[PDB]
């Protein structure tokens, strides 16, 4: 173990800007046709969810609040992104994680969010759906769901490696990293390795690059079979070029630790 990897817990998107989120939510809701528009009482319940999360209240979100959150994230694609941001923030909370990601009903949740990861989608929706998936690994239910749904989610992640949206790429790299944390924890890794390598090949953002290298170091750590697979495959050859990268320093340093294992 070194200062980069192996990560033992999920890397999350924790920035909390509830005023901005709630502001935009109300503004965009106002542009909805009347049939789809959330009511004043619906908006109060979403505000309350944000209050509980942002104030770290011991009061748990209600069934009624989580039902409204579900309704909110099912609104027209042009205006869903603030409600997705409430979800991204809320999904780390045990009550919310369990009621969206549990065994029986989680497939409905993930399939909905995966629909928002379509390459022609609104980039804000793609970004927030990815960040939400990153965040749901903090809970046991979220972790189970991400593993059972991994074929679908990894397929969709890979398709977003295109272009140059740095924030989406960072979220992709973080999704790979959170998967690596799960495989590190237990004993699959070959699939996770193709994911990391495929994205790493194309991404330009150095934060995304860094998180992919952390994902790779985490994936092979403390598993002699995984190190040997990586060595046999010649992973060292594909990441050698990062060993020369001078800024940020963390990229070359993380890469040199991986190269030390291989």
């Amino acid at each position: 173990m070194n200062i980069y990897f192996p990560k033992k817990e999920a890397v999350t998107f924790d920035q909390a800007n509830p005023t901005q989120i709630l502001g935009k939510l109300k503004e965009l809701n106002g542009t909805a046709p009347e049939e789809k528009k959330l009511t004043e009482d619906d908006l109060i319940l979403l505000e309350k969810i944000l209050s509980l999360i942002c104030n770290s209240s011991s009061e748990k979100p209600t069934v009624q609040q989580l039902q409204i959150l579900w309704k909110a994230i099912n609104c027209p694609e042009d205006i869903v992104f603030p409600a997705l941001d409430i979800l991204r923030l809320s999904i780390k909370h045990p009550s919310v994680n369990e009621n969206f990601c549990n065994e029986k009903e989680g497939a409905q949740f993930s399939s909905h969010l995966i629909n928002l990861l379509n390459p022609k989608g609104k980039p804000a929706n793609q970004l927030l759906a990815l960040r939400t998936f990153c965040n749901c690994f903090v809970g046991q239910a979220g972790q189970k769901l991400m593993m059972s749904q991994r074929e679908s989610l990894m397929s969709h992640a890979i398709e977003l490696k295109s272009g140059s949206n740095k924030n989406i790429h960072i979220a992709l790299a973080t999704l790979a990293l959170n998967y690596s944390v799960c495989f590190h924890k237990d004993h699959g890794k070959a699939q996770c390795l193709s994911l990391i390598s495929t994205i790493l090949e194309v991404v330009q953002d150095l934060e995304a690059t860094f998180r992919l290298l952390v994902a790779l170091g985490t994936l092979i750590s403390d598993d002699s079979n995984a190190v040997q697979l990586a060595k046999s495959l010649g992973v060292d050859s594909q990441i050698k070029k990062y060993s020369s990268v001078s800024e940020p320093a963390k990229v070359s340093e993380c890469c040199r630790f991986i190269l030390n294992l291989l």
Binding site: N17, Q20, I21, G23, K24, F81, A124, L128
Partner: peptide, 4 residues
């Protein structure tokens, strides 16, 4: 870049 979202907000807003």
């Amino acid at each position: 870049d979202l907000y807003g």
